[PDB]
Design a binder for this molecule. Structure first.
Ligand SMILES: OC[C@H]1O[C@H](O[C@H]2[C@H](O)[C@@H](O)[C@@H](O)O[C@@H]2CO)[C@H](O)[C@@H](O)[C@@H]1O
Lengths: 22, 509
């Protein structure tokens, strides 16, 4: 729950890294 | 799929215990065991499992889902001879024909009716428009006028269709898949009437099938809307009930969709001859249909001989009166995405997440986006999991994912590993709960292609893990859940950015 939120926010951070790359 | 037995799937609101009794007579005569199951969401589980060669020998559902199953190669063409065909009504065979071939056995014709409590309401309303005033009066007595399932669009369709809504337009012998009919004034007038009942507290947006059934059968509400399968539980409840024509709206009949309960044979079944024997010579007989109908009523059965025996039942007469005012559902493969989109629209309007106009305006592009997205994401997740590969835009999108999505999983493996590990995905409920992670990806209000491709990439990472822990059948519901998050909440963004063509363009090089 906290775990699912932390995982979802990590995916968002990775996704922004990917967005910046491309 | 095990040779030498039959596994049958049918929905949990139908007479599956009666069907098992027919199976016991088959077993008596043949030694072949017949297992009847009623999984949840069976109409979605079937195409998922059957596509990998698994699932039941025989699948029961209304005919509207069978065109898509057939198009995907999941159904055996059935081979009843002309003398067998003559035993069932022609219009029921018409509902189970796809691209010229018969792809299921018709069982019974279903339509919703108004069910009312004769003790609370001996003279039920003829019009929807009377229901607010009636509910106010009944509330002063500790009762309510009307409760029915607001979570499945099947039950609100009669009202939406009354003044002009339609699914797909039929002209020149076929449905125009580019002409969906919920974004028009009649559809909107009907859904507005329903949402206004909710706004004025005559109905609750959360009411689902079980809640409505319990209210009517405990005598708390004067009316419900349901099909013939429900009559058995009302019999048990001792409520004094009648079954009648649905109320009019703007003076026009409610137009319920007509479904033909149908039984298809899995293309992957090693038991097709046994399945044919069971269906033709055990189920589709007076004695077979009687056993099912005694458990949960079937409606107007497809078998002429038994339909004639039952036709005197006033409840069945009312079913057919409502059916004659409605339309036969299409069976085209777009129907699943259509229902996805209309379900979202009704729930969004009923809850106030959208206005009625916005909700119905979104439906057509939502269904197209869902169908296309689901295909891309499911193909990528499954090929990643299996290691083997099994329309131009979808081809390019999959080639993009093989590069970019595999690339995310390479570059971010350490994070992805500890992500899926902290989540500790052990079973089917854990996989369902991943939809919460997905929503969190967008919870700060930002949408972009990097986040979208990263979520899909993590879906592929999880799908590989699911296969390793013997939960490979959970890959398709994972894909569907990702698709749902994207289409339900990011439709506007996906449209602005030109959908999957924009995805391919963004990640080009
Ligand atoms: O709500 C969309 C839904 O409508 C129909 O499903 C009916 C079914 O035909 C009935 O036999 C009964 O089980 O209730 C269902 C509604 O909960 C469509 O057949 C189905 O494809 C569609 O999703």
């Amino acid at each position: 729950s906290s775990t699912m939120g932390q995982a979802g926010r990590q995916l968002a951070i990775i996704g922004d890294d990917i967005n910046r790359r491309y | 799929i095990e040779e030498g037995k039959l596994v049958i799937w049918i929905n949990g609101d139908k007479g599956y215990n009666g069907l098992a009794e027919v199976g016991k007579k088959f077993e008596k005569d043949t030694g072949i065991k017949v297992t009847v199951e009623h999984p949840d969401k069976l109409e979605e589980k079937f195409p998922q499992v059957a596509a990998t060669g698994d699932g039941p020998d025989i699948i029961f559902w209304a005919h509207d889902r069978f065109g898509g199953y057939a198009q995907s190669g999941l159904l055996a063409e059935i081979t009843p001879d002309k003398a067998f065909q003559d035993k069932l009504y022609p219009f029921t065979w018409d509902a189970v024909r796809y691209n010229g071939k018969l792809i299921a056995y018709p069982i019974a014709v279903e339509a919703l009716s108004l069910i009312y409590n004769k003790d609370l309401l001996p003279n039920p309303p003829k019009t929807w428009e009377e229901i607010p005033a009636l509910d106010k009066e009944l509330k002063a007595k500790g009762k309510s006028a009307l409760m029915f399932n607001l979570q499945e669009p099947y039950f609100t369709w009669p009202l939406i269709a009354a003044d002009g809504g339609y699914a797909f337009k039929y002209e020149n012998g076929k449905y125009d898949i580019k002409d969906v009919g919920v974004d028009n004034a009649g559809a909107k007038a009907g859904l507005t009437f329903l949402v206004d009942l909710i706004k004025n507290k005559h109905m609750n947006a959360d009411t689902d099938y079980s809640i409505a059934e319990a209210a009517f059968n405990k005598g708390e509400t004067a009316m419900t809307i349901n099909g013939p399968w429900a009559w058995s539980n009302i019999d048990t409840s001792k409520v004094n009930y009648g079954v009648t024509v649905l109320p009019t709206f703007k003076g026009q009949p409610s137009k319920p969709f007509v479904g033909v309960l149908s039984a298809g044979i899995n293309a992957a079944s090693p038991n097709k001859e046994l399945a044919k024997e069971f269906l033709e010579n055990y189920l589709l007989t007076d004695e077979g249909l009687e056993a099912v109908n005694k458990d949960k009523p079937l409606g107007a059965v497809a078998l002429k001989s038994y339909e004639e025996e039952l036709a005197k039942d006033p409840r069945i007469a009312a079913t057919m009166e409502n059916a004659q005012k409605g339309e036969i559902m299409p069976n085209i493969p777009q129907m699943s995405a259509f229902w996805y989109a209309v379900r979202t629209a009704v729930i969004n309007a009923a809850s106030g997440r959208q206005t009625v106009d916005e909700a119905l305006k979104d439906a057509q592009t939502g269904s197209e986006l869902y169908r296309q997205s689901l295909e891309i994401i499911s193909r990528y997740l499954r090929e990643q999991a299996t290691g083997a590969a099994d329309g131009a835009t979808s081809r390019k999108a999959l080639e993009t994912l093989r590069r970019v999505g595999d690339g995310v999983q390479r570059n971010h493996e350490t994070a992805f590993q500890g992500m899926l590990r902290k989540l500790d995905i052990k079973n089917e409920d854990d996989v369902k709960s991943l939809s919460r992670v997905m929503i969190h990806v967008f919870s700060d209000g930002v949408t972009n292609w990097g986040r979208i491709v990263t979520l899909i990439s993590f879906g592929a990472f999880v799908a590989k893990h699911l296969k390793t822990i013997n939960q490979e059948s959970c890959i398709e519901p994972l894909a569907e859940s990702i698709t749902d998050v994207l289409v339900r909440t990011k439709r506007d963004w996906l449209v602005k950015q030109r959908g999957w063509d924009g995805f391919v363009e963004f990640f080009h090089v």
